[PDB]
Amino acid sequence: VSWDSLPDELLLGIFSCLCLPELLKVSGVCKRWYRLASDESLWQTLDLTGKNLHPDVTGRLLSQGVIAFRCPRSFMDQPLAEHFSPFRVQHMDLSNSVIEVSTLHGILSQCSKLQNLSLEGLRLSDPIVNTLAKNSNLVRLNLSGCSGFSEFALQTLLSSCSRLDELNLSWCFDFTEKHVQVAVAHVSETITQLNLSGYRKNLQKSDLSTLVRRCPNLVHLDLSDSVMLKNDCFQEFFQLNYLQHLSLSRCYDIIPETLLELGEIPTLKTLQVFGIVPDGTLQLLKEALPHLQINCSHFTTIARPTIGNKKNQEIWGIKCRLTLQ
Amino acid sequence: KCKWLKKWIKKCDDDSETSNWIAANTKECPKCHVTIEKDGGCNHMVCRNQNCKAEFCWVCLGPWEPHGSAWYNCNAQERSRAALQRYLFYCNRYMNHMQSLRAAHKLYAQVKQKMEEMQQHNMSWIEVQFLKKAVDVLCQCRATLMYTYVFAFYLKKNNQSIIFENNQADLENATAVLSGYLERDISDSLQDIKQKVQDKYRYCESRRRVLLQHVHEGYEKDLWEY
Amino acid sequence: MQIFVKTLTGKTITLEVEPSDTIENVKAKIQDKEGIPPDQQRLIFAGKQLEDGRTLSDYNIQKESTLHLVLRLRG
Amino acid sequence: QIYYSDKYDDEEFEYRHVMLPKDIAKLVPKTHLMSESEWRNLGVQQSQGWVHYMIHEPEPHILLFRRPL
């Protein structure tokens, strides 16, 4: 009958088997339970997508020891007014979420060990990305479709980080050939997954030549809907004897014949060329090249938070534990 | 005989057949007259020079009016075109034999490794002996087949030369099959391949002897009309 | 001990060469001497189309052995 | 078929919500949003700048793109 003797270990064991609403309800019992309701193990993984809630609340609930926070397509629409230690979290995704740049910088000022990162759709500034430059341990990066960032701070960010192996940077309207110049000049050449699609008259073949001559190991390359990558570009693709993903869809100047030279590379596994090869002759491509999946993977999964089965509440295999049904 | 060999090797871009390539597929521009070759099949070209502003197809060689309109549509070339084909054939196979002769060293190393591998695969040094002999006779066959071609160039065709060409073709086919065997099948049909290689290289050696005998007969009875 | 190349203005020019060069580098040399567009060019020697891959001695271009150049107008 | 609508727009950007039939509308994922080039690969056509920028849960197979000036 004596509750007053049950220890911290057993009470934490009980609280390890509760759902978020009741868990937050019972935090209001006494000071002891208040300490117990935040023990850097209950809050390991959290998911609060869709919401529009208080920036100080999310700052505290990130300070309490989350290693993987999943919250895309959400709002936190109020500025931040309290600053704490550099946040320990290592898996941050804000893909297509909506939030003001002030709250963005207030939260990203404490980025320390962000192993996997995604900030699709949001507006960022040069101080924001150069505070992101603190993280030299980032591996998966998805900064597609941002606005306001500049080339100088971009390339300083790339020089600062060193574990660049996933990079999804498609449809950032302010990318140019000088942007991809600084990109190749400052990324770690270990990179193997790169996305620079859609920039029809923003990129240039010579910068791709720089990318492939400094990066003979990249495997997953994406520059679709970029007509300004002429046929000699294929030659530089012919340089890469390591590629397995290659997306150059929507390139009118390309032909089904010259792209056959890419199939001359046995390492080429799948190809995403939707549009350049019309119906009928793609089967001839398949017959002439019998180990290539031409236009069979409609999307790339480079540093994407989730993919498949249309439920997939997990993120990169790190299943979140606490959510709201 | 060395007069014809000196003439053949004295080519310096052959001094004649380059002009046959000029007469093959080069035509001067109606604005900046210079050796110009159409490629492709578009038949709609603009003279892509630094100064030339004048567009024309290949086969007009004249007014730009037809293509884009309905004005005219193009209203010893062949007699020298075949000579290019024959010269390309003969010099091409000459160069093929030269190239496959220069790579004898790698051939020696490959067959020595193959012979050692077969020796540790339950057979004595006799395997190494007859593969070395096969390599030697193949090299000799190439080294004489080259010169049989260079002789088969500089002569006027008569009733006898068809036979000579047929014999060279058969010997060349045999040599190709032998090189194929040798570089293809060290891997376990060793007895059967020993049979095949032995028969093939004996036949090639005898056949080359026949060709040399025929050539010397032709020099003796004086039939070869250049 | 040089190689001569037929310039389109006549006047066969001379270069400096080693017997194991690369045809793309010879294209670079002739473009350096002229400025001609170095993708629409075919080299012709002894009546055979000199490709880009192998070396001079492979097609047997010795020293003081001329060649010729023709354009590859893409329309 | 692929039903477009008028240029109902926000203050600055411009929207035009589209409607897709069963076959080309039965592959839109509940997980995330498509890249503009991604739905181009899937074959939808419209003007330049139309990034797939949000999903509305009541209409899962009915897209609402975004475009700049």
């Binding site: 549009g275 | 578009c42 070209m45 | 329309g75 | 477009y4 181009r40 056509q45 419209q46 003007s47």
Partner: peptide, 11 residues
């Protein structure tokens, strides 16, 4: 000797 026009189509 430009395709697959990515303009906004008809109603």
């Amino acid at each position: 000797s430009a395709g697959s026009v990515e303009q906004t189509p008809r109603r």
